[PDB]
Ligand binder design. Structure first.
Ligand code: MG
Ligand code: ZN
Ligand code: ZN
Lengths: 1404, 205, 129, 49, 33
């Protein structure tokens, strides 16, 4: 007895033979009766020994009730054998490789004794082996035919002799196979073919067939009762007519019981949901019951705003608080507190509903406990939810790490409130809005869950984004506008001041301790900056940034106050500037709340957000804010100005049209006239910058609510205002105008065919306030429908990609070395290459990067002591700068537009620590002290040397044990930052004890920033990269959809994640640098090279071609006039006479003169690119003098050297080969433009200068080899968007860097942290090959993780292959433990807890 | 321009492998004449371990890459001489790596001489200085003792490490063999460079 | 005759591409039990894991201690708190928690569970209060 | 083609001495105050209002 | 000189155009047909 605690460590999959069924069966099904009255009939399929599903009886086998009984399998002894439905393909493979007479293998086992085990049998069965002679019994192997009428019948074809392979005969055949043959064919000894035939099937436990799937079982039992029990079928017995039909229907019944309505690739044959149909798809067993679950003790409601709630609070209706209960166990310390809940009971709130008495080991109703007076120790009380309880708040779809957060409950006692109320600043965590969104709320009742909710999942932990490493929450909408209105210097009423009474009223709802106004007279005037400083003095921070209010596009108009365009906060005091989206807005990196979180913790940041939001809202409570129709109304003069601007745009469009009409539009090389015309029209119809002048002439910026919302960043943008007031402009769909889809050349019924006006192609000349006409409204509806379609399918595409990425990355978990490993196989030597949490990073500028050799000496070379130590320190600084420059200039070289930056994300802002210590210092300008300065230098040097020990522990630091090289590299950036910010020049007014404190603070901050052991960093990366994907979809109508540049939708991300080959890429690009640094400046040379490497083939320049059976030294009549220019060619080319091997076959091609002119293709170029290309040929051209009307004709005469298959067919193949020859360019490059490149180079003074005058070729299509062959391109700086090309030519490391770069390009400016891209790239390249995020990548990376691959997709094939291969599935990661009903061993469960026996004995 | 780049870069491939050149160096024109006439060019190099490395530069239209019997005869004859022959390198065109028959003779010859290393490589592997490519980080082979101490500190097996193919261009230029360890200094945008150790596995072909 | 509740036949198409000899002894077939392990505790001076508790480890320690105080309640704390969560948090903060943290570094094939045992009463606590 | 990148400011009050300031877009914030108003745009090529 | 895009130095743009005008004219005629 006493079943001890255990955990499943591995799962073994095997084929279950009839012996296993007999061993595991608790009962034998023998009758067809279902129920004997109110009880199951004994021996039937419902027999209670199989388990109980009804309350009306117990099990018998385990003597448990329905809830505690897991069910037990039975046995049905089949009178005739049946084939295993899941392994029909295995039966077919085994039948074709072993002799059906003696069981010996007909194939040569030595032939396949070099393949891997999972492939030996497949290749053995691939060979024909029909008619092969056995070397043991000299029998002839028949043709194993799979019947096309069903999925299980096999036919033996002996040179036309047809006999049915019955399961009994198959078992006789399979029982003669030795285990030696099984092993030599790559199969496990548990995969002997004798298990593929079942004489005793297993009827599943009733637990999986509750009281249809039992109809099939009943029918199977009934049909099995018909077959005689002594039936003995041998090869060639001629079962007459009815045993045959009965056997076929029994086998079909079993096959439909197991595999009905599921196909699988391993299905051989043709023509009540089954067992295997329950598993797959969203509603299947795995995804619906194992990966997710329905739960109890949970609530859902609509969410609405409540500005009186803190960011970490949620408004809970009281009716829900008396439904969900918290389980508090009564002990000595809580009996007094819990007694009021017990006394209130179910009649008053806060009360309780149930009590679990320990003495009775059962739950007691509160209305039956009226005689208990008090509660006993060990009792469990289920009390109502009260204010201050923690709750899990969740909004679906749950895509971010903050999609589930823990809030403190605020119980709303108003009975008429049924919504989940929350602060509007908390919506950023969930991507929620108050327009109908519903959120799930469940209160943790168990002690462990409550501890975790208040310690691990509180929303204060999600204030900093795991994705972007920046703040998530901030002021939104009314709060941003209110902050601007409160902090602005002047109102339309004069100076922005309030009296003491209204200044006090601003702090009424801040929920903080109010500031002191006793030093203010009732008539004293306080500006908004003063009250903002009063609030922000509690968390003093330093801020200096231009506000969103100041925009350069607005500067020519308006009159910006000089005190409003430079926001400065010094030690919590707002000196100047306004507060808006840049400073207080949500998601504003570097904003005031981000700084507050960095210096005082995210809880302080949330409290400050609430306080400042209350301040702004209380200010607007008096200032007022509104938008009216007149806010969007231009003055008549401004309307005339807008009309004039649009008239100028349409006049430029009409000038382009006039150029087209006169045939003056000449497209460049690479574009057709239609494409060039469309590009010119798109450029001509863009609104100028001066469209804002009429708008701002009609707008009073100090009074305009719409302009104030747009300019302060609260809501809207400049295009919104322009569309509302001036005009929408050109409607662009996928970068192009409206296509003529109504008819041939017609965009709408309202416009004529081949209309040239811009209005016919989507140019909207009217503003929204002016109103749109019917065609303008139709074009706008097309654009809006595009937006709606993209929004709708963004959810689905993001779901697909997110699920694939999660299942590809979920097993990646940080271990105790802070490496990332799948089980035990490494993915990263250190997480994010720095071992840091994404929530603990700060962007910091490195001051030495851009300095020249002289400013570096003038700013960092300390000359106050004549010591070599400071020379060494400056040398160390210079070497750090040089290493940084080299690394991040190399990074520039293998990227398209990744510029070297002065700022880095670091765990510790050293300069801020030094500034804080100096500000708190009770000293200043210390006297010169050589000993102190040298001591501080020594301390800093030792701290830098011992910095990588924060990655190990204090013990190894004390022992000074060797540091691994990768850990030394992990601290390189922090060593650089410390040596810069703690340089001797910068630490002259810092004492030695102050230096010790600074170093201790740096060490503490570095330790606090490390990634936790057991973090599911793969899932974090999957979320952080899948979240920007829906925004990437939302701009799908702003991306090109044409061939060669197809970037619409998820085409590029699916290309990246699926590791699609080069030929499968639709937006391949390459970047080529000229192999001459001094001539990259010439745009003409760059254009020359770009047009030179553009791929031109013979087919591009052919109007038509005709192959002829005529030799030369007769002639198709339609071209008898060709002999004139033919003889002219003979006369003009004396050394090009026809050779004496001229054959009958010859092509005659007409050259397209228009294409030749447009592509600058000369006839001599063709003649030399075909003559010195083709060995067995004789080519002739007409006199190129041809004007319009007479054509250039190229007759290519073949030779029998080519003919050295049907002659005509090989001649046509030769024609195809000749046509595809490369006349000009490099293969695979459809287009090649010239782009201006921004690059950094170190000049002779050691300075890093940003150069804008670099020209490079941005090709369409990739060929790294071809681009590296030409000598006009720098071969060492070829950048191609193709991951496969980079992998094939450069290697797996360059492929990893390319994956990083391409994912970064897809994410865009608002992308995740670099460590998530590193996670994606390192998972995909861990095996030395670029594996995908699809099923194939999982198969390559985790073949043994059968459960994970079943959970991803295709459970039936994965299960079948696992059973056949006898796969052992170790339980690791998340999917495998979850499918086994266990919990993943990560997070809180990554490290186990044991009892400190010594301490417990010595401290009872 | 494949043959020119091959000619200029194969010798720096040999030098980067720290191999002393044998015989002499021929001009470009004589090189392509030999490639067209004999069907291939052979370059002999000597390693520091007194072994011999032979590089065979076959032609795209050469007969040795179109008929399997010719390649079999060449490999059997070259392997029948009296030299240590540490490694045989056969540089062929990219579609030659797809013609299964030639790969079959390569495998048969590799099985025939287990102590002899035979590898077939495409043209693009030696058409550029691979270690000088900007996109390729610095790869370096670490001795088995350093790898063993690194694995012992990390409580790791060689099979737990990230894998790299022996046909990886940096690994080929380094001369790494399967079962060896390569230390890679990769540039990092989070830590400003990083160090990773990868396990060299079986080369593709 | 018209049936509406169709089952939508389900298809899998991407096939997987995973890459003397006697009947069976009592050793190769069987022995699913897996050999027992011995606990190889790394010496305190050879430990390489952090001397600071992770938030996961500290949270798990507090949760375990509070759950144990739910059924037990004999506490070494000085000040009286009315909830097991607060008691466990103060026990961790006062370095009086009776639990230990075992970090399983590696499980060897020979049957050794190499672990590092860490005392939370000599460790850095990252939790808030 | 015209390039209207010069902003011409007229002094609101006749007491303002310069009475005429021509600036680019990036110079408005540092050279123009409320004593001036935008009068016209001058082309940067033809120097025509 | 620099005559590919400037066209404001005169003389050099003019000689090039006058001494290759008819080729451009006939190419334009052929293209737009
Ligand atoms: Mg909504
Ligand atoms: Zn039971
Ligand atoms: Zn036989």
């Amino acid at each position: 007895m006493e079943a001890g605690y255990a955990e499943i460590a591995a799962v073994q999959f095997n084929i279950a033979g009839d012996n296993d069924h007999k061993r595991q069966g608790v009962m034998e099904v023998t009758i067809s009766n279902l129920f004997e009255g109110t009880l199951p009939a004994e021996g039937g399929i419902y027999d209670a020994r199989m388990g109980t599903t009804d309350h009306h009886y117990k099990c018998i086998t385990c003597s448990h009730q329905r809830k505690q009984c897991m069910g037990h399998p039975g046995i049905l002894q089949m009178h005739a054998p049946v084939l295993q439905p899941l392994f029909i393909a295995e039966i077919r493979r085994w039948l074709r490789v072993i002799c059906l007479n003696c069981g010996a293998p007909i194939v040569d086992l030595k032939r396949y004794e070099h393949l891997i085990r999972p492939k030996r049998l497949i290749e053995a069965a691939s060979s024909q082996t029909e008619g092969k002679q056995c070397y043991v019994c000299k029998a002839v192997h028949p043709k194993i035919v799979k019947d096309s009428e069903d999925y299980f019948t096999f036919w033996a074809d002996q040179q036309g002799k047809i006999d049915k392979l019955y399961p009994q005969i198959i078992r006789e055949i399979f029982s003669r196979v030795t285990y030696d043959t099984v092993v030599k064919l790559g199969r496990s000894k548990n995969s002997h073919p004798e298990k593929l035939v079942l004489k005793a099937i297993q009827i599943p436990p009733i637990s999986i067939r509750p009281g249809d799937i039992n109809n099939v079982i009943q029918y199977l039992v009934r049909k099995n009762l018909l077959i005689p029990k002594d039936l003995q079928i041998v090869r060639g017995q001629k079962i007459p007519l009815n045993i045959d039909r009965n056997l076929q229907t029994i086998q079909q019944l079993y096959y439909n019981f197991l595999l009905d309505s599921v196909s699988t690739t391993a299905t051989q044959g043709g023509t009540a949901p089954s067992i295997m149909r329950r598993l797959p798809r969203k509603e299947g067993r795995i995804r619906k019951s194992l990966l997710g679950s329905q739960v109890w003790s949970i609530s859902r409601s609509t969410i609405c705003g409540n500005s009186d709630l803190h960011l970490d609070e949620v408004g809970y209706p009281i009716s829900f608080a008396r439904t969900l209960q918290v389980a508090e166990t009564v002990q000595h310390y809580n009996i007094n507190r819990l007694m009021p809940y017990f006394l209130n009971g179910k009649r008053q709130y806060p009360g309780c509903s149930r009590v679990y008495k320990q003495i009775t080991q059962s739950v007691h109703d509160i209305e039956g406990l009226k005689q208990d007076f008090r509660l006993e120790v060990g009792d469990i009380l289920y009390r109502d939810v009260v204010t201050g309880d923690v709750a899990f708040f969740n909004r679906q779809p749950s895509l971010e790490r903050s999609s589930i957060g823990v809030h403190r409950i605020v119980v709303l006692e108003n009975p008429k409130i049924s919504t989940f109320q929350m602060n509007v600043s908390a919506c950023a965590w969930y991507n929620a809005d108050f327009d109908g969104d519903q959120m799930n709320l469940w209160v943790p009742w168990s002690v462990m869950s409550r501890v975790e909710a208040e310690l691990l999942c509180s929303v204060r932990n999600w204030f900093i984004s795991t994705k972007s490493s920046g703040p998530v929450n901030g002021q939104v909408q009314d709060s941003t506008v209110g902050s601007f209105l409160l902090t602005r210097t002047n109102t339309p009423m004069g100076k922005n001041v309030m009296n003491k009474l209204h200044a006090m009223g601003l702090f009424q709802t801040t929920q903080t301790d109010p500031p002191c106004f006793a030093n203010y007279s009732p008539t004293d005037l306080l500006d908004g900056k003063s009250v903002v400083s009063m609030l922000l003095r509690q968390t003093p921070i330093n801020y200096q940034r231009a506000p969103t209010w100041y925009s350069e596009v607005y500067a020519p108009y308006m009159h910006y106050n000089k005190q409003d365009i430079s926001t400065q906060i010094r030690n919590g005091e707002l000196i100047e500037g306004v507060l808006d989206k840049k400073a207080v807005g949500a998601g504003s990196s570097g904003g005031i709340y981000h700084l507050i979180s960095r210096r005082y913790g995210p809880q302080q940041a949330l409290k400050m957000i609430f306080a400042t939001q209350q301040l702004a809202l209380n200010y607007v409570r008096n200032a007022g804010f509104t938008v009216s129709t007149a806010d969007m109304l231009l003055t008549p003069e401004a309307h005339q100005e807008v009309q004039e601007i649009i008239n100028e745009l349409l006049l430029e469009s009409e000038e382009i049209n006039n150029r087209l009409l006169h045939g003056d539009i000449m497209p460049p090389i690479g574009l057709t006239t239609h494409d060039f015309y469309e590009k010119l029209q798109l450029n001509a119809l863009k609104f100028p910058d001066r469209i804002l002048k009429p708008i701002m002439n009609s707008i009073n910026p100090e009074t305009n609510g719409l302009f104030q919302m747009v300019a302060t960043g609260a809501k809207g943008s400049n295009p919104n205002m322009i569309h509302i007031m001036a005009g929408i402009g050109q409607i662009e769909i996928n970068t192009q105008r409206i296509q003529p889809q109504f008819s041939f050349g017609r965009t709408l019924v309202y416009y004529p065919r081949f209309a040239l006006e811009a209005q016919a192609y989507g140019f909207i000349c009217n503003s929204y306030i002016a109103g749109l006409t019917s065609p303008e409204f139709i074009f706008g509806e097309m654009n809006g429908r595009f937006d709606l379609i993209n929004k709708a399918l963004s959810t689905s595409s993001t779901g697909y990609a997110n699920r694939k990425a999660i299942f590809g990355l979920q097993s990646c978990i940080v271990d105790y070395y802070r490496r990332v490993s799948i089980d035990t196989r490494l993915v990263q030597q250190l997480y994010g290459e720095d071992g840091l949490d994404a929530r603990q990073l700060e962007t910091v500028r490195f001051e030495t990067i851009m300095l020249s050799d002289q400013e570096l000496e003038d700013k960092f070379k300390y000359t106050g002591i004549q010591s070599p130590l400071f020379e060494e320190e400056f040398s160390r600084l210079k070497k750090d700068r040089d290493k940084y420059r080299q690394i991040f200039l190399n990074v520039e070289n293998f990227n398209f537009s990744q510029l070297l930056t002065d700022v880095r994300q670091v765990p510790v802002n050293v300069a801020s620590i030094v500034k804080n210590i100096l500000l708190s210092s009770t000293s200043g300008v210390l006297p010169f002290d050589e000993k102190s300065i040298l001591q501080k230098y020594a301390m800093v040097k030792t701290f830098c040397k011992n910095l990588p020990y924060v990655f190990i522990n204090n013990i190894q630091e004390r022992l000074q044990t060797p540091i691994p090289v990768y850990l030394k590299r992990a601290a390189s950036l922090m060593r650089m930052l410390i040596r810069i910010e703690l340089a001797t020049v910068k630490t002259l007014n810092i004492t030695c004890e102050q230096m010790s404190a600074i170093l201790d603070l740096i060490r503490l901050q570095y330790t606090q920033s490390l990634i936790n052991y057991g973090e599911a960093v793969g899932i974090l990366a999957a979320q952080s990269v899948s979240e920007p994907l829906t925004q990437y979809m939302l701009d799908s109508h702003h991306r090109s959809v044409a061939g060669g540049t197809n970037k619409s939708g998820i085409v590029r991300p699916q290309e990246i994640f699926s590791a699609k080959p080069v030929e499968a890429e639709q937006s391949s690009e390459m970047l080529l640098r000229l192999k001459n640094p001094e001539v990259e400046t010439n745009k003409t040379y760059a254009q020359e090279i770009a047009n030179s490497i553009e791929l031109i083939t013979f087919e591009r320049l052919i109007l038509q071609w005709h192959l002829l059976y005529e030799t030369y030294s007769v002639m198709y009549p339609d071209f008898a006039s060709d002999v004139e220019w033919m003889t002219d060619f003979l006369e003009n080319h004396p050394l090009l006479q026809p050779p004496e091997d001229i054959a009958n076959w010859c092509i005659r091609l007409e050259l397209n003169k228009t294409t030749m002119i447009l592509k600058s293709i000369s006839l001599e170029s063709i003649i030399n690119s075909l003559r010195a290309k083709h060995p067995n040929t004789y080519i002739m051209h007409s006199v190129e003098n041809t004007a319009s009307g007479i054509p250039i004709i190229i007759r290519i005469y073949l030779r029998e050297s080519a003919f050295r298959a049907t002659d005509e067919k090989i001649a046509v193949n030769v024609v195809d080969k000749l046509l595809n020859s490369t006349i000009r360019g490099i293969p695979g490059i459809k287009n090649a433009n010239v782009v201006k490149l921004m690059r950094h180079r170190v000049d002779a003074q050691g300075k890093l200068v940003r150069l804008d005058n670099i020209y490079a070729i941005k090709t369409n299509g990739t060929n790294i080899f071809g681009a590296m062959l030409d000598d006009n391109i720098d071969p060492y700086t070829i950048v191609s968007s193709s991951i496969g090309d980079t992998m094939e030519l450069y290697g797996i490391e360059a492929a990893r860097q390319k994956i990083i770069s391409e994912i970064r390009t897809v994410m865009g400016d608002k992308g995740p942290n670099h460590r998530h891209l590193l996670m994606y790239a390192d998972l995909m390249t861990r095996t030395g090959q670029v594996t995908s995020l699809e099923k194939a990548g999982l198969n390559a990376r985790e073949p043994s993780n059968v459960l994970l691959r079943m959970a991803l997709s295709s459970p039936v094939q994965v299960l079948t292959d696992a059973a056949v291969d006898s796969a052992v599935n170790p339980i690791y990661g998340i999917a495998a433990p979850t499918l086994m009903g266990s919990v993943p061993r990560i997070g809180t469960m990554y490290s186990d807890i044991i009892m400190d026996e010594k301490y417990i004995t010595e401290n009872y | 321009m494949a043959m020119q780049k091959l000619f200029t870069y194969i010798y720096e491939f040999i030098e980067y492998r720290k191999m002393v050149l044998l015989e002499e160096k021929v001009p470009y024109d004589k090189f392509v004449q030999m490639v067209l006439n004999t069907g291939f060019f052979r370059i002999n190099a000597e390693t520091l371990n007194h072994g011999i490395v032979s590089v065979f530069i076959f032609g795209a239209n050469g007969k040795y890459v179109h008929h399997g019997g010719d390649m079999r005869t060449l490999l059997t004859n070259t392997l029948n001489e009296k030299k240590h022959y540490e490694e045989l390198i056969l540089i062929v065109d990219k579609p030659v790596l797809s013609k299964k028959n030639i790969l079959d003779i390569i495998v048969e010859q590799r099985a025939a001489n287990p102590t002899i290393v035979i590898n077939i490589y495409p043209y693009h592997l030696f058409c550029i200085n691979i270690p000088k490519v900007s996109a390729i980080p610095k790869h370096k082979l670490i001795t088995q003792e350093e790898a063993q101490e690194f694995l012992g500190r990390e409580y790791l097996q060689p099979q737990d490490l990230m894998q790299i193919s022996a046909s990886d261009p940096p690994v080929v230029w380094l001369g790494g063999r399967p079962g060896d360890f390569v230390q890679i200094e990769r540039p990092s945008e989070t830590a400003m460079h990083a160090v990773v150790i990868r396990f060299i596995t079986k080369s593709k072909i | 005759l018209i049936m509406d509740d169709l089952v939508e036949e389900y298809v899998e198409t991407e096939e997987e591409n995973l890459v003397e000899i006697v009947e069976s002894p009592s050793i190769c077939e069987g022995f699913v039990q897996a050999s027992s392990q011995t606990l190889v505790i790394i010496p305190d001076n050879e430990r390489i894991t952090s001397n600071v508790l992770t938030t996961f480890e500290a949270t798990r320690l507090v949760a375990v201690r509070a759950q144990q105080l739910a059924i037990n309640g004999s506490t070494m704390l000085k000040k009286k708190y009315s909830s097991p969560i607060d008691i466990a948090k103060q026990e961790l903060f006062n370095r009086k928690i009776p639990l230990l943290v075992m970090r399983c570094i590696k499980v060897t094939p020979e049957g050794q569970k190499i672990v590092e045992i860490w005392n939370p009463r000599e460790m850095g606590i990252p939790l808030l209060d | 083609p015209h390039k209207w990148t010069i902003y011409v400011y007229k002094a609101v009050d006749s007491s303002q001495k310069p009475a005429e300031i021509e600036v680019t877009r990036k110079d408005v914030i540092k050279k123009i105050d409320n004593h001036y108003a935008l009068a016209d745009l001058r082309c940067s090529v033809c120097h025509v209002l | 000189l620099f005559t590919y895009i400037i066209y404001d130095h005169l003389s050099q743009p003019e000689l090039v155009h006058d001494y290759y005008n008819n080729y451009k004219d006939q190419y334009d005629k052929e293209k737009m047909s």
